[PDB]
Write a protein that binds this DNA or RNA. Sequence first.
DNA 1: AGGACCC
DNA 2: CTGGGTCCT
Length: 376
Amino acid sequence: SSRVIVHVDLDCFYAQVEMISNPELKDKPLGVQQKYLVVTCNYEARKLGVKKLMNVRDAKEKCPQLVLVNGEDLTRYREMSYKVTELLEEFSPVVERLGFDENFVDLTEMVEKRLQQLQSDELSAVTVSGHVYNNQSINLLDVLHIRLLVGSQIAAEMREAMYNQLGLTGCAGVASNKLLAKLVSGVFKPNQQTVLLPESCQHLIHSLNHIKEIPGIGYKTAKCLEALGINSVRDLQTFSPKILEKELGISVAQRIQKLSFGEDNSPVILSGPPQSFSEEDSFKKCSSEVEAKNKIEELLASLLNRVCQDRKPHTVRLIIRRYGRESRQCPIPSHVIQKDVMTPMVDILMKLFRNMVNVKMPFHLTLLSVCFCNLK
DNA sequence: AGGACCC
DNA sequence: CTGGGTCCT
Ligand SMILES: Nc1ncnc2c1ncn2[C@@]12C[C@H](O)[C@@H](COP(=O)(O)OP(=O)(O)OP(=O)(O)O)[C@@H]1C2
Ligand SMILES: [Ca+2]
Ligand SMILES: [Ca+2]
Ligand SMILES: [Ca+2]
């Protein structure tokens, strides 16, 4: 029937993890730097012009007093990421990750259990925790309203637990599907939560200013819709189903058009241990086989540290970039799957390397990544 | 092995 | 010159 989903979204995640490590950064404007980029900054610096993924020189040209911290190494953020997911998994076991700082949790069964605990007395004392989207009025006789309020109380417990137990703040959105939870969780930022009652749903989706803002509609699909005279959510709502299939495929079409009406029936899928783990690095230039081999050696070494834990990988891939992506994989021989070990691994990779780049020709590499997948 | 998508 | 991830085709 009607679900109750929460979407949890950590405030300035990398910045926030750095500030926890020393508050000498907190209260001071702060950017987290990767290569020539500040990828994220604290709010104490966001109001001073600093934007996410902003060029590091333009970031100084709007704030020369910002503290820069190098967050090229994801290790600490990743460990924090799973601590968050695991805490949420305590509430209900089916938690879906999206990147390092977002989780969906299906609160439906939990919402039911709590209501069954209540008497017909306390069913009228129930209150909302956090903002109601659009200041819509609650109607306690509306059983959908009552379930969504209970969901907002659970969302508040989640947020409180994350803070008491891990020191992290985040936003939460409670709604009836995954699309809507995610759209509404950002209505009040940072460190706040908002709940979407059913009658405000159209208000929510029409609140958007371009189709590119609908999660599921990425870089290419946007540029495609934009080339059919489709700019607004309503343009996509009202556009012809038949034509739309012809440019995107009956799959993309019928899904994104449904999204345009705030409709999303995709289940919250339990993420669990990952399906892959890699190590990446980019650079301005790399046109040798010795340079490449050396970079590749570092990536494998860090990867190998992570390769312990839960279980073992039975495939390896190598990714390069030109001047887009090009990969080459192959499986990892039996005896190799026992944890030197670098030596034959480096050989596999370099053979994979040579397979895809002419090592006696000019070649200009701007990225290198080593991936372990197919985990058993 | 590449496509799209996500943060 | 971001450092990671997911599923589908
Ligand atoms: N292409 C990218 N788009 C969005 N985020 C990206 C992209 N590439 C790298 N990232 C990040 C930027 C941030 O450091 C990190 C997450 O950024 P978020 O958009 O989730 O938001 P945030 O936690 O930094 O702050 P906030 O928007 O306040 O919640 C992720 C690696
Ligand atoms: Ca976000
Ligand atoms: Ca975030
Ligand atoms: Ca989008």
